[PDB]
Design a protein around this ligand. Structure first.
Ligand code: BQ2
Lengths: 169, 462
């Protein structure tokens, strides 16, 4: 069984946690203990190929800025997450992408842009702006809603697809 | 016989337990036989915080650490006062029911409320420092309390309140302070290679231990270090992280600004020696600040430098790096297995508190009624409790105040911003060891003193 080491990155106050939590946790239980191994590993079928996702989310450690390379180096594919109500988190994405390319020593690293909606304040980043940025990087864009679970699977499955299209090459 | 309390119309904590106001986890409190509360209304949580049948120190600590997400401090004080002020049941034309009720309901409950006040004032005094009217109300409540049973507790609380309004030496001999090339008092000469590596690691372990120990649960509960007021609410956690970040960057800088290959090999080698001593001291914060530097993009790519690193030190570094692998699997097991003193890596705790708070609901609903999810808070209080267990025991090491100063005032970034500085480190890495196919240049030596390490073993006996 193929295992994909995925890494979530983004600014604090953004819902990175919710994204990964909502993927892992059962569709209808709101229970989560992040200490145990099942917290970050999940078996899934994507395009009829069973595989194992290992997700690294270091949410809460954003101030340890010198550890980003360490954490990013562990990954094959990356979700670059911003919050649709925080313009600054959107503007920081270019920095994250650049640092990933540098760490992986590659111009073409499997990557998806994810814009997450949680709760108020209201949207400051229109989806078009994000579609445009994603297009300039040549990567997919997925918008998600943490609380309704909309987009969560799509975000992760799209990154796995990106990894497969990268490896066949 | 049961007990016959007043009606809920007169005293709200009389209401019986039901699925609509209190629910339990299926297991029983360790050491103590008490049921584990999963969720309840604030009224029921306060009833059980001050319960007549038994004391519950675990619930009290957990509640007072985590309550502020669901109940404001002023509201808590109002509720425990309301709890305290118990009226009697009504008719019995006259004392069978009453002497029992006084001795088995009123007196215990009142003692429990005093115990809550005592723990609140002793262990969470910050609520009072930040809201002087909260302290005013507590002092006039405590002055109100009457009984002879109560006097000794009231006196004790009043003593703690006065102590709180007010503004290290060893078990036996610490080891001898170690000096290499820089001599005592000559702070102007201090550098990575000129200080003794043992003493670098020791003095950094002392800084990082004190930093780890100053962090309080008030800076962590509610994930406050990630919110806009983090500098107001989490100043000690932030100083701690900044120090760690500074040293990772200092190590990177020492490496890539040493342009001569041979000298750079000695620098990396010396840093691995410091890692070895961190590992001996159980300073895992130190271990990881070295591992982060080695894993940094400017350092990791220096294959000509790591080629010349002796195999013994290669293995030390590899073992240290493997602590971080698989979501810190081996770090977690190693930490569990060692005895204080130590300095944990804080980052895991931060992530776990955040994810716990984010991945569980604030309330659970039963029969249309909203219950505070207490188990969520318990989980957070377990983590803050684990942090505190490693804060009690200090290191048996002598401070050297000059070396301490040097590492406190270390500022590798200078006046530069993060991006500018890390791009500089990376461009420097490219300069000193260019990408294939470009050939490796040579660079002149910068160090006029000898490069050989004194090693990592103490120089004198006992
Ligand atoms: O050998 C090399 C470079 O070729 N390295 C690069 C830095 C590093 C980081 C973690 C674990 C081991 C190593 C050893």
């Amino acid at each position: 069984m193929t295992e994909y080491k995925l890494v979530v990155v983004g600014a604090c106050g953004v819902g990175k946690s919710a994204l990964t939590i909502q993927l892992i946790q059962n569709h209808f239980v709101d229970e989560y203990d992040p200490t145990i191994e099942d917290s970050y590993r999940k078996q899934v079928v994507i395009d009829g190929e069973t595989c194992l996702l290992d997700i690294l989310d270091t949410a809460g450690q954003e101030e340890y800025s010198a550890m980003r390379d360490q954490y990013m180096r562990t990954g094959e594919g990356f979700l670059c997450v911003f919050a649709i109500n925080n313009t600054k988190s959107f503007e920081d994405i270019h920095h994250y992408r650049e640092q990933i390319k540098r760490v992986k020593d590659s111009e073409d690293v499997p990557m998806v842009l994810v814009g997450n909606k949680s709760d108020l304040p209201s949207r400051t980043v229109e989806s078009r702006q994000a579609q445009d940025l994603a297009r300039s990087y040549g990567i997919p864009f997925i918008e998600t809603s943490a609380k309704t679970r909309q987009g969560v699977d799509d975000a992760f499955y799209t990154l796995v697809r990106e990894i497969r299209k990268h490896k066949e090459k | 016989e049961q007990m016959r309390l007043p009606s809920a119309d007169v005293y709200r904590f009389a209401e019986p337990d039901s699925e609509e106001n209190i629910i339990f986890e299926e297991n029983m409190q360790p050491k103590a036989g008490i049921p584990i509360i999963k969720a309840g209304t604030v009224i029921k949580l306060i009833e059980r915080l001050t319960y007549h049948m038994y004391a519950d120190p675990n619930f009290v600590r957990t509640f007072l650490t985590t309550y502020r997400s669901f109940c404001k401090p002023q509201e808590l004080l109002s509720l425990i006062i309301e709890r305290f002020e118990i009226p009697e049941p009504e008719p019995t034309e006259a004392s069978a029911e009453l002497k029992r009720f006084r001795k088995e309901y009123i007196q215990p409950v009142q003692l429990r409320v005093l115990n809550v006040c005592r723990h609140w004032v002793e262990h969470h005094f910050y609520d009072f420092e930040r809201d002087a009217y909260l302290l005013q109300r507590m002092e006039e409540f405590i002055g109100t309390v009457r009984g002879k049973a109560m006097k000794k507790w009231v006196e004790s609380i009043t003593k703690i309140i006065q102590r709180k309004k007010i503004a290290i030496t060893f078990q036996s001999s610490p080891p001898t302070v170690e000096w290499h090339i820089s001599r005592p008092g000559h702070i102007e000469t201090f550098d990575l290679l000129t200080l003794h590596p043992i003493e670098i690691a020791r003095q950094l372990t002392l800084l990082e231990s004190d930093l780890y120990r100053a962090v309080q649960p008030s800076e962590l509960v509610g994930s406050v270090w990630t919110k806009e007021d983090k500098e107001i609410n989490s100043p000690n956690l932030l100083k701690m992280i900044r120090h760690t970040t500074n040293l990772t960057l200092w190590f990177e800088k020492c490496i890539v600004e040493t342009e001569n290959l041979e000298e750079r090999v000695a620098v990396v080698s010396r840093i691995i020696e410091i890692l070895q001593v961190f590992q001996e001291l159980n300073n895992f914060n130190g271990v990881l600040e070295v591992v982060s530097a080695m894993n940094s993009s400017p350092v990791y790519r220096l294959d000509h430098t790591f080629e010349q690193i002796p195999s013994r030190q290669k293995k030390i570094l590899e073992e240290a790096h493997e602590l971080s692998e698989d979501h810190y699997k081996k770090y977690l097991a190693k930490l569990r297995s060692i005895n204080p003193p130590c300095v944990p890596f804080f980052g895991i705790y931060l992530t776990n508190i955040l994810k716990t708070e984010e991945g569980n609901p604030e309330v659970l609903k039963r029969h249309g009624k909203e219950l505070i999810n207490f188990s969520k808070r318990r989980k957070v209080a377990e983590i803050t409790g684990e942090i505190q267990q490693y804060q009690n025991q200090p290191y048996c090491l002598r401070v050297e105040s000059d070396i301490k100063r040097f590492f406190e005032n270390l500022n590798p970034m200078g006046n530069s911003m993060e991006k500018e500085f890390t791009d500089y480190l990376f461009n420097k890495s490219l300069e000193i060891e260019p990408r294939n196919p470009k050939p490796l240049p040579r660079f002149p030596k910068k160090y006029s003193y000898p490069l050989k390490s004194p090693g990592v073993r103490p120089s004198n006996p006992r």
